[PDB]
């Protein structure tokens, strides 16, 4: 602001800088222009270019970011709306909950069963219902076709108090909105970031000289998005899935503003369905499907763009800005972040530059499981349509040794809403309907199995072929693989083969596909396959970073890649549904386009330790919770708390040999003579005498018309010869629990890798939710004794809900770990927990964890050495010990926790961390300023607001369930009741939905926690031996499974968290208003104090 008459370098003709070491860099007298609009930009970052000599940059960011959090909330509006709301607080009153209904004017346009089954020399005969004929022909018509079977729309929005539909102008009275649009920030200069090349002369009269001044233009982002991104409300499927989303009242497209408004320059103003880039809603079904105006493109608004600045690094003659982390513009629930990488090059020896930026989607398109040694089948891949929306949380790209590493978190493709809801089952699946609609920004992944469809991707016209459901709807029915048809030869070639599908026509088969959430995802989730660009079933892109990430990005390749990007025909969407019907995953790009050049850039990646299967969740069990320090297992020191994450040593051992076909299983999924596995909590069995497998008592009677009726004329198939046989398996698995674990029954397991990774992230954060019945209120207390019998979890004694709990864990064990009942957390038992009451229906909901360590949290990547590195995440300090050079038998990472309780529980514990670095001693640290804790702006103004915002506060909807049978609780799925109007009857339960009330109940709501007064000091991660994290002896031991053997290893080393890589960072207290650190190669100093004068060489001059 106040430097007078600066100048740029008086370069030579070809661009060299004239620098006499003493006379200094040659000045031009006049510095780079735009003084008026550039002197007012704070310097936030500075980088060195090692390739060229003594070159430097400064990152000039506008200061509205610096004071962002202090602006009037009227302009910067939170996504959630609260107002007075002096009527309790109904979490469902902002959710569109009315289900779709069949129309009374378009009955005959339902999908029509095929005329006559094609024998085709077919020796196999099936008594079940016959397939549907689905074909779309181009014919000859501009805005229509001759037959569009997908565009059949029998259902409609319920006419309840008018149409129920998503439309912002009355579903958001005060909608989320940015400050400056993408074009606005591009045209404006003083309010946008900037990178300036300049030169420093520490020992010359011309101390400083300047090079070039360069701006970062979001127009490069806009021009460099794939064309499909312009129409996110659509998708590659775009026709049947679009109609299904309309009717189910859920996401339109893959990245609509309704679920992700941060990147829409109109914000939530387009949180609707109209204008998806294709004709939609038109009466004639064939008419809809042709492209038209697209008024919902994806751009870089003010908040996302500012999150897109930070941790930039330079390589060779070009520089990259890899994105900020969003905290600067992160409000209480909305989560903006960096979406697309930025690149800057320089010509003729830093004489001129070009501004350009890329979408991270093309950067990360080339991902395959063989790359990562961590968890497989992740929702990371993509297809030729870049309807995948990555966005990185940046820990700081550092030149780690000889490789370039990007680490932090990114947002997985949404694996939560991959399932769908039956048309008449929206008012009794509040949890997932909210998780999808967009009124629940919580990204953990809830377990409601009753109402899933047989396939999440059945066209709407194929839903009402069996409207009653008594016939069990072979084309469409609530998912329940208890009835799943056999994959037996005769079964398959009788049910699906004969209905052969050509290019023009595809057959929706009557075959009863089914399977629990795991099979549902393994089918319709963008799991990574060994070939990249191999994700055809991509639903949506998640809320907030639930994926820890660390990858290696090719320095040479990224240098080579071209600034501008050109797209071929395949990049945009299908012209018309005639072409769409025959979509391919691979097509010949026009060689004159350079978009696919950017693909194979990621060398590898990792999110957790290099572990697989239930062993990984056993690790999850091992990791402790900062809120108390007690690990989830709690086993050390008979109605005792059971492990919540890992199902090992839970329930009773069942035989996979009796599961399903009963054939070829003794030595398939278990390399032991006795395939003994633990069915987990929530399991059921016939009785103590017989446990392995369960007879088909899972029969589902829709009406009172008797059970599912196997062996029925339709239910049994007849191949050539007349040997009638049933297509439903004899004996089913003994767990459809929320923690159901099945290595064999890949259609009954629930412990998927999205579960595993998201739980890793948010358990390291420590804010995994809970499901409760009773608060601490008198006469409404879930006391421990006489109502918590852990040993018996088959009955209601185990208090397992089975509906509304987050998949992959056990509620009672989770709450014991928290301390909501017992001495784990508070001196007096908080008397908060879940009961499996059998007297009548049970109402319940979820709440926060008390902690508020949000997910976008990240440190600064401290490069310990060329073989390991890390940063601080939340209150934990990770260290990618074995990522660059993974070693067999090593766990993969080491962890360090945080000491200061006042820091732990404070409202916003990330106005505390003030940068990270590597201390010269050989162990990094991070700064803490307890006096800087920026809590909520007001204590609910002055009146106690039941809804009070926070980093991790979300509209956890109620879940009301039917009464539970006292014995054999979970033979079938626990049916839900119509819970839409159950909010007013659970005011006490929703009182705990606010973190302030949670901490008030816990007894740690104020400074009453005692101990450190403020705890203003420096925290140091634990020293890690190169062997730290070794589990070499823990693995193997093929006498039984890896999960159990490592569970035994942990139980033999549970009290040795240091060796595994678990600990609390050492803390040192020094008085001072800590604000930052300064770095010198000899030693980094803190807060700018600690002047040194070369003690060793004092006597030389």
């Amino acid at each position: 602001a106040k430097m007078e008459n600066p100048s740029t370098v008086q370069r030579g003709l070809n661009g060299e800088p004239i620098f006499d070491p003493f006379k200094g860099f040659g000045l031009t007298g006049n510095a780079p222009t735009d003084w008026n609009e550039i002197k007012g930009k704070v310097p936030v970052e500075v980088v060195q270019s090692p390739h060229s000599p003594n070159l430097y940059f400064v990152l000039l960011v506008p200061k509205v970011a610096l004071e962002y959090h202090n602006l009037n909330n009227q302009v910067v509006k939170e996504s959630l709306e609260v107002k007075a709301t002096q009527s309790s607080f109904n979490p469902t009153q902002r959710l569109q909950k009315d289900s779709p209904v069949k129309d009374s004017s378009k009955q005959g346009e339902k999908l029509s069963e095929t005329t006559a089954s094609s024998m085709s020399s077919g020796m196999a005969t099936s008594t079940r219902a016959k397939a549907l004929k689905v074909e779309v022909e181009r014919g000859s018509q501009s805005d229509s076709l001759l037959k569009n079977d997908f565009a059949k729309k029998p259902l409609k929005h319920k006419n309840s108090s008018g149409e129920v539909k998503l439309e912002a102008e009355k579903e958001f009275t005060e909608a989320w909105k940015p400050l400056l649009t993408t074009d606005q920030i591009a045209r404006e200069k003083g309010m946008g970031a900037t990178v300036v090349s300049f030169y420093d002369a520490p020992y010359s009269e011309n101390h400083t000289a300047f090079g070039l001044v360069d701006h970062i233009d979001p127009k490069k982002m806009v021009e460099n998005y794939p064309p499909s991104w312009k129409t996110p409300k659509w998708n590659h499927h775009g026709i049947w899935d679009y109609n299904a989303r309309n009717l189910l009242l859920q996401t339109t497209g893959f990245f609509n503003p309704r679920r992700h408004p941060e990147w829409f320059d109109e914000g939530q103003a387009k949180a609707d369905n109209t204008s998806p880039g294709f004709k939609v809603g038109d009466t004639d079904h064939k008419k809809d499907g042709f492209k038209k105006n697209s008024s919902s493109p994806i751009a870089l608004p003010f908040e996302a763009y500012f999150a897109n600045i930070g941790n930039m690094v330079a390589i060779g003659n070009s520089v990259f800005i890899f994105g900020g982390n969003g905290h600067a513009t992160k409000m209480f629930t909305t989560n903006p972040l960096s979406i697309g990488v930025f690149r800057i090059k320089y010509t003729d020896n830093f004489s001129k530059s070009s501004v350009t930026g890329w979408p991270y989607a093309v950067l990360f398109g080339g991902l395959i499981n063989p790359q990562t040694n961590g968890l497989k089948d992740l929702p990371l891949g993509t297809n030729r349509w870049f309807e995948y929306v990555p966005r990185m949380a940046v820990s700081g790209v550092k030149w780690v040794g000889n490789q370039l590493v990007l680490a932090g978190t990114l947002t997985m493709g949404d694996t939560a809403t991959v399932p769908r809801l039956k048309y008449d089952q929206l008012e009794k699946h509040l949890n997932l309907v909210a998780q999808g609609q967009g009124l629940l920004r919580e990204d953990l992944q809830i377990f409601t199995p009753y109402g899933w469809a047989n396939r999440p991707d059945i066209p709407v016209g194929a839903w009402l072929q069996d409207e009653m459901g008594s016939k069990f709807g072979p084309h469409y029915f609530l998912n329940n693989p208890d009835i799943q048809d056999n994959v037996n030869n005769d079964t398959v070639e009788a049910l699906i083969s004969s209905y052969k599908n050509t290019d023009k026509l595809k057959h929706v088969y009557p075959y009863r596909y089914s399977g629990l959430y795991a099979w549902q995802l393994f089918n319709w989730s963008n799991k990574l396959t060994n070939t990249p660009l191999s994700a055809n079933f991509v639903n949506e892109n998640s809320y907030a970073p639930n994926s820890l990430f660390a990858a290696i990005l090719n320095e040479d390749l990224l240098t080579g890649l071209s600034d501008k990007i050109f797209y071929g025909k395949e990049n945009e969407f299908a012209e018309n549904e005639a072409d769409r019907f025959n979509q391919l995953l691979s097509l010949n790009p026009n060689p004159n386009t350079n978009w696919a050049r950017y693909l194979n850039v990621v060398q590898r990646f990792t999110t957790g330790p290099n572990l697989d299967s239930s062993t990984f969740d056993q690790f999850l069990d091992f990791l402790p919770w900062i809120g108390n320090g007690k690990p989830f297992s709690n086993s050390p020191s008979s109605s005792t708390p059971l492990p919540t994450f890992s199902n090992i040593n839970v329930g009773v051992k069942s035989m996979i040999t009796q599961h399903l076909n009963k054939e070829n299983t003794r030595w398939v999924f278990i390399p032991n003579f006795s395939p003994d596995i633990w069915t987990g909590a929530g399991y059921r069995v016939q009785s103590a005498n017989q446990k392995n497998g369960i007879p088909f008592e899972q029969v589902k009677p829709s009406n009172n018309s008797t059970p599912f009726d196997p062996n029925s004329d339709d239910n049994k198939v007849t191949p050539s010869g007349g040997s009638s046989k049933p297509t439903t398996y004899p004996a089913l698995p003994n767990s459809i629990s929320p923690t159901s674990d099945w290595i064999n029954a890949l259609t009954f397991t629930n412990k998927n890798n999205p579960q595993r990774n998201q739980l890793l992230l948010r358990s390291l954060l420590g804010t995994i939710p809970v499901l409760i019945n009773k608060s601490g209120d008198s006469n409404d207390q879930f006391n421990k004794d006489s109502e918590q019998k852990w040993d018996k979890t088959e009955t209601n004694e185990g208090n397992l809900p089975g509906f509304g709990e987050v998949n992959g864990l056990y509620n009672a064990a989770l709450l014991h770990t928290y301390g909501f009942f017992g001495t784990n957390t508070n001196s007096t038992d908080p008397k908060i927990g879940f009961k499996a009451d059998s007297s009548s229906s049970s109402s319940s909901t979820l709440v926060g964890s008390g902690l508020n360590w949000t997910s976008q949290d990240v440190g600064n990547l401290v490069v310990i050495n060329d073989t390991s590195f890390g940063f601080q995440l939340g209150g934990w300090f990770i260290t990618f010990t074995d990522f660059i050079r993974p070693r067999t038998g090593y766990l993969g990472i080491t962890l360090s926790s945080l000491q200061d309780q006042t820091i732990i529980w404070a409202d916003q514990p990330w106005t505390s961390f003030k940068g990270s670095y590597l201390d010269s001693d050989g162990t990094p640290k991070s700064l803490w300023d307890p006096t800087a804790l920026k809590s909520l702006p007001n204590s609910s103004t002055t009146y106690d607001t039941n809804p009070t915002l926070s980093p991790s506060f979300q509209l956890y909807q109620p879940n009301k369930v039917k009464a539970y049978q006292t014995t054999n609780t979970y033979n079938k799925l626990i049916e839900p009741v119509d819970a839409t109007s159950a909010a007013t009857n659970m005011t006490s339960l929703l009182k705990l939905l606010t973190t302030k009330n949670i901490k008030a109940k816990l007894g740690k709501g104020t400074a009453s926690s005692q101990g450190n007064n403020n705890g203003g000091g420096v925290s140091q991660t634990i020293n890690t031996i190169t062997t730290t994290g070794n589990i070499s002896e823990g693995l193997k031991e093929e006498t039984s499974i890896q999960a159990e053997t490592l569970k035994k290893f942990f139980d033999s080393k549970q009290n040795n968290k240091s060796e595994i890589g678990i600990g609390d960072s050492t803390f040192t207290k020094m008085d001072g208003k800590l604000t930052g650190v300064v770095s010198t190669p000899l030693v980094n100093l803190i807060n700018g104090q600690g002047a040194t004068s070369d003690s060793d060489t004092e006597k030389i001059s």
């Binding site: 080579g560 071209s562 995953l585 194979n600 070829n664």
Partner: protein, 902 residues
């Protein structure tokens, strides 16, 4: 200095300016005293010598079943035109004058007693066609293991009967033996002549091994179906005259020559250079029995016969791999001594789909795919049940096989008796047998026993002889087992899904070869009569699945397969459909070409020499081939659990996968930069379609580039030894064309390269950059270089910016202004800092600068010679001479006066 072929008979020296040199286009046929019927295959530079390998249209080799010299050239029909490899040297006054140095002949393979007898009843499947359909590849299945062991009416007593039939504990009563040769894709003897007709579907069409039937009426029927030149039918057959001719198989107008001549011409395809040897190898398109190991010091008429692959026992990686590979050839003890087969005579996989050859540090490297060899019955009566059939079976590793890639390869399943068949498991269908050893659904119940599927009753009366499969695959039978093994869909259900190695099908061959064992091969070739086998050590082989996504319906490769995948419509070749955009209509038979070894130019830590990584292409994914020069051997790590560190298959993307693989022409390893480049042009594609339609995309070329990333060996002492296989990474450069046809390639420099193409009989010049792999066209600079006066270099002008910028020598009084008059002439001459000050030079691009050299014209005034670079980086002046020819550029030499004598 740049040498590349414009056509099949001429190479020319090209300047770094991308300007062909006059009186340099040498007609090699005239030079080496070769008749015009010959053509040049490919050139290899080694110690500045443009070696060559010559092939001819007139070559004619005859085959006989009698006489010691069963294989010989067709002398009686003026057709004896043996190929020759010619050493070269430009030993002159430094000038562009190629001359003969040594003329080495390529001799006919010598056939000894045992392999003669085997060949007498040997047949070869007709070749791959660029239009080939998967339905054409596959063909009717055959009778199953039990149905051939106990015949029919053998059910309900399998458990009690299989013990006495050397099949104890066999859990697969429906084990397949292969596909019936009665009808389908044609097979022919070496003496026989291949048909130009490949049946569209193997379910009904074709005639196969029945040569007499093929001649009787199938010839006429097929010709009527797809006549050779759109009102045609082409409903059951597709003529492949044009495709066959394009892929390098010479014809007598319509009919081909005999199979022996076709194999000779195909094998004379590629050449490798070693300080003590120069080895020749066969093209990837069709297999090659034999190859040449030739010492360089031999005489000009040296009878340099090749060596059979059977004469050289490769190394597959494991003794168990060797055993599994040799077992499935043919019955060990035929007892019908006449019916000699590969296994009966202790032979080896004889047909390799050789990708490419190259030599680095005088070490040759070979890679490709292994073609299937199996026994066939030549009984034709009482005709046996299995008669007229293929005896093959995928030997995939069973599900229960424990962890460890070594264990996967060393498990017992698929030794001799087929075990992989239809099965049902949990909610899916593991086509692979879920059991091995004694493991069963009840636990240990008796180890699985197996033997070759041939009933002993016919042992004394079964005429078994080997065949050759013209593709990597082994069992063409239309079955889910084979389809999944080929396309890579089988994963073991364990928690850590381990890929199943299909033991003796779609296997990859790779590994360096030492000069000592090349000499051993030479000596084995010298031996005649009592053949002496050879052993290769530094070679290994691992399974390489075809890209799975090329097949319709198949989406995600996993272990839990969707129920719909069990249907015959999508788990059988005939039902299977291909979406492969790589110029192949099939999706099962893999193809590779264009190996080019190279030395990594990046620094290597002291004490360990330069590291070199070989790279071999393959559709849908490239793989790097890594070695440790400490022992110059295959890169490996101690832990047998992990896969061999030497090999790492890297999948492709849509753009580079869609690059047709029938256009490999040349590979230019940019040694200094360290980036390969596989040039590809659609001209090499066949002129007409299988349905006789003209090809509409015969013009247009592009390149594929490979670099190195991940972790490299011996960068520092930390990475002296590795545990992760280094991986190449193919990319699409950007140099592409849809109408232009290339004339040659130019890896000019680290940061620049050039290309030349002809479209309308006019030379097109498009000079390109190189940003470590990615090339970009600079029109502002490409246009300027054209101003060459029809000469070797562009001209310079002081009115517009061209390839050499704008240099403006300072005023004649710059000496007066800079006080340089006082200083001495010797001082100014010995002051490089002051010398450059005489001029101001504006570069036209990066890495361009103007300088000066000491010169003298007079005591008072002396001229200055302007010396400037070009995109190639070589400084130029009037005195710059290449090949002894001055480059006569025409620099104006500035002259400054005012030099004193104090």
């Amino acid at each position: 200095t740049f040498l590349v072929k414009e056509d099949s008979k001429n190479v020319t020296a090209y300047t770094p300016f991308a300007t062909p040199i006059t009186d340099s286009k040498s007609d090699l046929v005239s030079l080496a005293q070769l008749d015009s019927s010959y053509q040049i295959a490919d050139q290899t530079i080694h110690n500045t010598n443009l070696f060559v390998l010559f092939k001819s249209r007139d070559v004619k080799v005859k085959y006989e079943s009698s006489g010691s010299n069963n294989i010989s050239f067709d002398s009686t029909s003026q057709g004896e035109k043996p190929s020759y490899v010619v050493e070269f040297t430009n030993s002159t006054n430094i000038g562009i004058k190629w001359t003969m140095v040594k003329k080495y002949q390529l001799d006919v393979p010598n056939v000894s007693s045992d392999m003669n007898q085997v060949l007498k009843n040997l047949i070869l499947e007709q070749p791959l066609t660029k239009y080939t359909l998967n339905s054409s590849l596959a063909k009717e299945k055959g009778k199953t293991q039990r149905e051939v062991h106990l015949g029919s009416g053998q059910a309900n007593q399998w458990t009690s009967q299989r013990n006495q039939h050397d099949l104890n504990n066999n859990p697969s009563p429906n084990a397949s033996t292969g596909f019936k040769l009665t009808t389908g894709n044609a097979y022919r003897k070496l003496s026989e002549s291949w048909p130009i007709y490949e049946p569209i579907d193997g379910t009904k069409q074709g005639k196969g091994k029945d040569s007499s039937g093929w001649s009787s009426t199938e010839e006429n029927e097929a010709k009527n179906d797809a006549p050779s030149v759109s009102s045609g039918t082409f409903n059951k057959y597709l003529n492949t005259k044009q495709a066959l001719e394009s892929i390098g198989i010479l014809f007598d107008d319509q009919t081909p020559r005999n199979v022996i001549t076709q194999l000779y011409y195909a094998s004379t395809s590629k050449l490798a250079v070693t300080n003590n040897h120069i080895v020749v190898m066969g093209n990837s398109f069709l297999p090659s029995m034999w190859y040449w190991v030739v010492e360089r010091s031999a005489q000009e008429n040296a009878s340099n016969k090749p060596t059979w692959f059977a004469n050289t026992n490769l190394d597959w990686g494991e003794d168990k791999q060797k055993q599994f590979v040799e077992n499935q050839l043919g019955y060990k003890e035929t007892t019908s001594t006449n019916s000699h087969n590969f296994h009966s005579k202790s032979f080896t996989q004889p047909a390799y789909l050789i990708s490419g050859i190259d030599s680095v540090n005088d070490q040759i490297i070979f890679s490709g795919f292994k073609a299937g060899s199996v026994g066939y019955d030549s009984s034709s009566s009482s005709s046996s049940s299995t008669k007229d059939q293929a005896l093959a079976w995928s030997t995939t590793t069973s599900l229960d096989s424990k962890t460890g890639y070594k264990d996967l390869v060393t498990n017992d399943t698929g030794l001799n008796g087929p075990i992989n068949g239809s099965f049902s498991i949990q909610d899916t269908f593991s086509f692979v047998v879920p059991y091995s050893g004694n493991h069963t659904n009840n636990g240990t119940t008796g180890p699985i026993k197996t033997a070759y599927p041939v009933k002993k009753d016919q042992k004394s009366t079964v005429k078994i002889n080997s065949l050759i499969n013209a593709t990597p695959l082994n069992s063409y039978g239309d079955e889910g087992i084979g389809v999944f093994d080929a396309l890579g869909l089988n994963y073991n259900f364990k928690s850590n899904q381990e890929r199943l190695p299909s033991r003796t099908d779609q296997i990859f061959v790779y590994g360096i070869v030492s000069p000592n064992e090349l000499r051993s091969a030479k000596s084995s070739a010298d031996s005649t009569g009592s053949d002496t086998k050879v052993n290769w050590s530094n070679t290994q082989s691992r399974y390489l699945p075809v890209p799975y996504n090329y097949s319709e319906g198949i989406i995600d490769a996993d272990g839990f397969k969707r129920p719909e995948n069990r249907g015959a419509s999508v788990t059988t070749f005939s039902g299977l459909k291909s979406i492969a955009p790589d110029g192949f209509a099939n999706s099962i038979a893999n193809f590779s070409v264009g190996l080019k070894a190279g030395i990594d130019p990046n620094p290597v830590m002291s004490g360990k020499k330069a590291n070199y990584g070989a790279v071999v292409l393959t559709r849908g994914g490239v793989v790097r081939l890594n070695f440790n020069p400490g022992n110059d051997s295959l890169l490996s790590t101690t832990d047998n659990n992990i896969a061999p560190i030497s090999f790492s298959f890297t999948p492709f993307t849509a753009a580079e996968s869609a690059v047709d693989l029938t256009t490999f022409k040349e590979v230019t390893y940019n040694q200094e930069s360290g980036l390969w480049s596989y040039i590809f042009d659609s001209s090499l594609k066949p002129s007409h379609d299988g349905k006789q339609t003209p090809v509409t995309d015969n013009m247009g070329f592009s390149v594929i580039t490979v670099s190195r990333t991940g972790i490299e060996l011996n960068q520092d002492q930390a990475t002296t030894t590795l545990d992760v296989a280094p991986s190449a990474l193919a990319v699409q450069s950007g140099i592409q064309s849809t109408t232009q046809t290339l004339t040659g390639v130019l890896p000019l420099s680290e940061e620049f390269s050039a290309v030349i193409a002809k479209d309308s009989d006019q030379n097109k010049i498009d000079i390109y950059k190189n940003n470590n792999g990615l090339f970009e066209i600079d029109t502002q600079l490409s246009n300027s270089v054209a101003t060459n006066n029809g000469g070797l270099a562009p001209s310079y002008t002081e009115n517009r910016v061209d390839a050499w910028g704008k240099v403006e020598f300072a005023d004649n009084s710059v000496l007066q202004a800079r006080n340089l008059v006082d200083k001495t002439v010797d001082e100014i001459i010995n002051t490089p800092e002051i010398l450059n000050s005489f001029f101001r030079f504006t570069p036209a691009f990066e890495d361009q600068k103007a300088t000066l050299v000491a010169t003298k014209q007079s005591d008072t005034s002396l001229s200055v010679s302007p010396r400037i670079q070009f995109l190639d980086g070589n400084f130029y002046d009037l005195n710059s001479t290449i090949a002894g020819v001055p480059l006569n550029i025409g620099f104006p030499s500035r002259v400054f006066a005012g030099f004193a004598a104090l």
